[model samples]
Target chain A: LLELDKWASLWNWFDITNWLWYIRIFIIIVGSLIGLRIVFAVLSLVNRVRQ
Target chain B: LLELDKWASLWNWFDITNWLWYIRIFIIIVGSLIGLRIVFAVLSLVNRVRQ
Candidate 1:
């Protein structure tokens, strides 16, 4: 009974997929590009303000 | 019958918590600091090579 419950609890549909690593990499690439773009925008704005 | 199955299948322990956001932010903060350190190290190495 306990063994049955343990396996049953671990069987979530949300984690049934194995693309988590790929998703992480995809997010990192997009995230890094966006972050750098924002950083550049901030630096450019600072330069314009200083000038 | 169908409803019971649906609810039973949705009880994943991993997704039951609201702490995922905090975990993600913590990872981002730590990841970015490490990324910055690596970039600085790479830049310094490049400067040394150019000299």
Candidate 2:
């Protein structure tokens, strides 16, 4: 049994205005930056090895 | 009136064994390769410019 009101409230927790939304965005940005840094470092190492 | 069965069915559509899941994985891999190619090109250009 699912109540529409309860389901709606749960869905609302993921709305852009919610704190969880900001935390998710922050994590995504941080993760992307870290991934980019690792990729750059690997590329630099490859270039050095080639030269 | 939210039906649990219906919600469960909808969620099942995104299961890893689904075709949509494969499509998503394909798109992600293609996008990542394109992004990496662009980054490598930019890095090479910058290195050349520095030299």
Candidate 3:
């Protein structure tokens, strides 16, 4: 779903070491991490028993 | 979870006269004014009792 992967691969179909490609991967990783963290926090609250 | 925060924070974002962003907050708030005005108007009318 990354735009960089689409454009770079479609243009040359090579060069995995490209800076743009690296940046895209970095963003994806960080975004995924943040999303998962949010999900975990929400789930923990949801599963908490009301006192 | 939205695209609003993105476009609203973009560069060269002149607000005086912009693209589709002008109708943004100003337009929405104005529209909502009519909504609340209508609701309150109706409520007041219905809340009146026969003397």
Candidate 4:
């Protein structure tokens, strides 16, 4: 039972690591690009309004 | 002893969650802005070279 508990704990750790990796990649890469695009679009609109 | 182990596990989980939150905020916000600035600087240099 102790060995089983150890395995369960290890599996949980592995799962959390993988989940964090996915979140980092998706948010930092994809989310950043999306954010940049939004910023640029808003800036362009502001420039047009100023002109 | 078992209670101590449970507390340790909970602390570990809390630590991981906070770490992930910090990583997301710093990388997605600061890193993204840095990346955009780098891209713009490079683009301007390329335009200068082309001209």
User: Ten consecutive residues with minimal summed lDDT in candidate 2 chain A?
Assistant: A24-33
Tell me the deviation in Å of residue A27 in model 2: 3.7
Please give each candidate's TM-score.
0.23, 0.27, 0.21, 0.25
lDDT of 1 by residue, A2-48 (tens): 34565566557557544433456655764665455445434644644
lDDT (10s digit) by residue, model 3, range B1-51: 435455456445565436654554464354344334435433543555524
Model 3 misplacement above 4 A: A1-51, B1-23, B44-47
Residue-level lDDT of model 2, residues A5-35, one tens digit each, is 7656766556643664466346435445544
> Which residue runs does candidate 4 get wrong by more than 4 Å?
A1-25, A29-51, B1-8, B13-17, B27-51
lDDT of 4 by residue, A1-51 (tens): 555455457556687746745665675465445445646633644665684
Q: Tell me the tens digit of each residue's lDDT in model 4 across B1-51.
A: 235566467666685657745674565465556556546545644644553
Query: Which lDDT values do the candidates have, in the order given?
Result: 0.51, 0.57, 0.47, 0.55
Listed in order, the DockQ scores are 0.05, 0.17, 0.01, 0.06
lDDT of 1 by residue, B1-51 (tens): 445455555356547444633575565565565445435433643665684
DockQ of 1: 0.05
Clashing residue pairs in candidate 1 (N, C-alpha, C atoms within 3 angstroms) = none
Who is ahead in DockQ, 2 or 3? 2
| Sequence-dependent TM-score of model 2 | 0.27
Please count the clashing residue pairs in each candidate, in the order shown: 0, 0, 0, 0
RMSD of 1: 12.8
